Amino acid sequence: QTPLYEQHTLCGARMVDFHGWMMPLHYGSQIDEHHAVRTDAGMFDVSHMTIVDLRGSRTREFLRYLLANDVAKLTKSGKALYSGMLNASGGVIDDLIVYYFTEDFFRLVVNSATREKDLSWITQHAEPFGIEITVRDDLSMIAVQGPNAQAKAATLFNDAQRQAVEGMKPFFGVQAGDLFIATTGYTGEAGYEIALPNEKAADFWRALVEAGVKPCGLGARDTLRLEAGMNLYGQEMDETISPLAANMGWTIAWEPADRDFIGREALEVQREHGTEKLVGLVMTEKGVLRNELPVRFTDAQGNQHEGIITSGTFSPTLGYSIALARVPEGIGETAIVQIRNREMPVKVTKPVFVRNGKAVAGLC
């Protein structure tokens, strides 16, 4: 149970189960919550996330072996990156954000659904490197997102905290007293994620409401992230799916070739052979694209292919249905899905739809 539970109820939360946590689906209007993030500021309780602190002189070394992105690229203190964590078959165990603070101190953030699997795996592979693993269940976290999010949050910062984040670029995190403030998010907008002691969380939440930040629930969390082309573990990938087939190729640090990491050789073979690809689908016709719907097309050579929707939704920003889908190579400009017992052509696009309050160029 989140430390924010009482504040959620006071904010009119309609609760659902989220991987064992009672969490707000919305607070009266998931559509308004979505539009708040796109145009002003909304916030999400992400205390269901697990923050894992890693300590030890070999921490960077460990993570260069654990992760498929390369934390050697984190050279400025506080810098973060996004990475897959792969099994030996090159499938995805999870995705995550990792922060570098010092050579003796990095931090990972992972989801509730995969927490115990990840912890077991991290623990197992950490042992020979002598890494001390500390789970930060003493911290809650709030994501404040939207074009006015940083400004509104910053009204609550003290002078030292303002100074710490002044000019801070994306994908950095910094500790300033009780607040860990990071320029991260799951929305396609600017914002912060802010971690702080459980016992401080409720008051900080209330202060943020007063600062003009709208409480936003899981429903908007999902429409926002899918519009932004951001993956959801279990849907866009899982242990059976290569990152190359989940639009995560860009996160694979192939060079330097001499960096060993788990999944490396399987991944190299997958790259050599080719994989399926994650694309976007747009359906302007009335109806909603659903998870697991088949996607059919014929390639130029006449081979009939079937992919699958990984995540679908009705886009509040665009006003029509969108989806991420995993499809065989060779797809064209359109494909077919079944809607109301009939074939429905859909437009095939890049796996991203909205960033910074606006439809991406291919959609306007």
Q: How many residues does the chain have?
A: 364
AA identity, residue 303 = N
Six-digit token pair at 270?
A: 């997958």
> Could you give the CA distance from residue 114 to residue 84 in angstroms, rounded to a whole number?
13
Answer for the pair 167, 154: CB distance below 8 angstroms, yes or no.
no
Answer for the pair 277, 351: CB distance below 8 angstroms, yes or no.
no
Coil/strand/helix, residue 231: coil
Half-sphere exposure in the Cβ direction for 197 (13 Å, CA): 5
Peptide bond into 256 cis (omega under 30): yes
Residues in contact with 67: Cβ distance below 8 Å, sequence separation at least 6, in sequence order? 83, 84, 85, 98, 261
Q: Give, in order, the Cα–Cα distances in Å from 299 to each of 169, 329, 342.
A: 43, 8, 21
Q: Which helix (H) or strand (E) element contains residue 337?
A: strand 334-339
Query: Which residues on neighbouring strands pair with residue 321, listed in sequence order?
Result: 283, 314
N-to-C CA span, the chain: 42
CA nearest 217: which of 50, 74, 70, 28? 28
Six-digit token pair at 205?
A: 């939440």
The domains located in the chain, with CATH, are 1-47+136-228 (3.30.1360.120), 48-135 (3.30.70.1400), 229-273 (4.10.1250.10), 274-364 (2.40.30.110)
Helix boundaries (H) for 2-112: 5-10, 30-39, 59-66
Q: Give, in order, the Cα–Cα distances in Å from 289 to each of 68, 214, 229, 326.
A: 32, 28, 15, 14
> Could you give the CA distance from residue 48 to residue 51 in angstroms, rounded to a whole number?
10
Coil/strand/helix, residue 315: strand
Q: What technique solved it?
A: X-ray
Quick one: resolution in A?
1.7
Spell out the SS3 assignment of 1-33: CCCCHHHHHHCCCEEEEECCEEEEEECCCHHHH
CA nearest 312: which of 345, 279, 277? 279
What are the DSSP calls for 130-144, one per residue? T-EEEE-TTEEEEEE
Six-digit token pair at 38?
A: 């796109």
> Could you give the CA distance from residue 234 to residue 194 in angstroms, rounded to a whole number?
25
CB-based burial label for 206 (10 Å; 0-12, 13-18, 19+): middle
CB-based burial label for 34 (10 Å; 0-12, 13-18, 19+): buried
> Could you give the CA distance from residue 270 to residue 240 in angstroms, rounded to a whole number?
13
Buried b / exposed e over 53-90, threshold 16 CB at 10 Å, is bbbbebbbebbbbbbbbbbeebeeebbbbbbbbbeeeb
| Residue 215 DSSP class | E
| Extended strands (E) in 150-289 | 173-176, 179-182, 191-197, 214-215, 277-283
- β-pairing verdict for 14-18 and 21-26: antiparallel
Query: Which residues on neighbouring strands pair with residue 193, listed in sequence order?
Result: 143, 182
Q: Give, in order, the Cα–Cα distances in Å from 236 to each of 100, 247, 248, 291, 295.
A: 27, 9, 10, 10, 15
Six-digit token pair at 157?
A: 């910062």
Coil/strand/helix, residue 324: strand
With tokens 């959620």, the residue in question is 8
> Could you give the CA distance from residue 316 to residue 318 in angstroms, rounded to a whole number?
6
Q: Give, in order, the Cα–Cα distances in Å from 20 to each of 113, 194, 340.
A: 9, 23, 34
| Residue 240 DSSP class | T
